[PDB]
Design a binder for this molecule. Sequence first.
Ligand SMILES: *C(=N)c1nnc(-c2ccccc2)s1
Length: 462
Amino acid sequence: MEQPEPDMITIFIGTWNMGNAPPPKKITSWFLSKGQGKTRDDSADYIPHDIYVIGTQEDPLSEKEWLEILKHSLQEITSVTFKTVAIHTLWNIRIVVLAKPEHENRISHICTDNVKTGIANTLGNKGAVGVSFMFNGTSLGFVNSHLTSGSEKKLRRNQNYMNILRFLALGDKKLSPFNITHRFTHLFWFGDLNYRVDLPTWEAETIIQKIKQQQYADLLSHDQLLTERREQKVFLHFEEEEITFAPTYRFERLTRDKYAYTKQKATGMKYNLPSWCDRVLWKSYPLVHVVCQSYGSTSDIMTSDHSPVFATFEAGVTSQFVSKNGPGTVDSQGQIEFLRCYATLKTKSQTKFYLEFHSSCLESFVKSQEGENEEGSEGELVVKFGETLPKLKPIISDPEYLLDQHILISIKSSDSDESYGEGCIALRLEATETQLPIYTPLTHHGELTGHFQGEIKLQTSQ
Ligand SMILES: *C(=N)c1nnc(-c2ccccc2)s1
């Protein structure tokens, strides 16, 4: 007898800047999503999440010490002894992934990496750690970043973000044109992102009184991460749940009754106005199920100048599909065709371009012919592929497999073979054997570089 394979799992994400102090004896409220914000229902307390991903910053513990605390905490809550999937530490920045023991044979292709962000001076305590793995047919990635501190350094934080997403090496290395923002079905990025509430320092007491009233609107309108995202300066194409918990920084230790904001020698004579430093964001491939179930902060863990943050997700997953044909051959009953396709690029360059199509549903990636460059009406380069793109041959034709897949697209220069833009198309279509519009934005280094649009026609065995 075998259990069915899951269609959905739940994932816990935690981020906590520990302020170089040991944790208190009990930290279960964190893993229970209890405290302020969007919290988890009490009736779920004994129900284990499938995967727990724990990001720390300013973590003073050894890996062994922290693992023991984490496993004990989850055992107490759930009566389950979790398996360690991965642990990786850079300086005092750490990521731990734990999973239910039933998932040990569902998890494979485990990767870890780190990125150090500074230059000389600025190099040596900020950066990121990450973990990726496959869960059956679904790729999962997780990034814990500790970005540059200081209210006046939002630009440096955005630069840290770009370095991390360029240089963190996770997932399938065959996806060579793609950075981490395209390599995973579900990507979770969290940490002490260190974006601040940008209000005058003389408004400190006003801010605290707003917090005490649980009136966050006029504060969130000045949150640097929200404003930079709105201006497409950082975290393009990521999501974040609405914030309904108090700022998680900077507290006096051993209570939560007081924000410590005034400039001190220990802060480099900087103010630390109350801010949402500690965040969880995500990006999933188009038309995959992902729902945030909790996003909040604990109220009873007081050893640090930050409060822990939790977020939980229901995430769609797929099985490791086997047919009589693929893997190991094509299924001639399946095809993917593209009509009337063109890329619009922001480049000022005039080279020829071709496409690469990458997907787990193909034996290997497919390179197209060169498109035909035209100039658009408002200055743009338009690369026309017409009806010229190849017919893609998936390994499996069953619609229960193929409609759950995605095609990554890179548009590459013929001259340099470098990608000018990356994007993703879902095969979760409204119809098969029917021409339907497709669209993706194209990015490079996580910044918008163009668009790809056209029509698709998918043939399955039904
Ligand atoms: C990370 N260290 C990895 N290197 N290759 C990986 C991979 C291969 C196939 C499918 C997914 C991931 S993971």
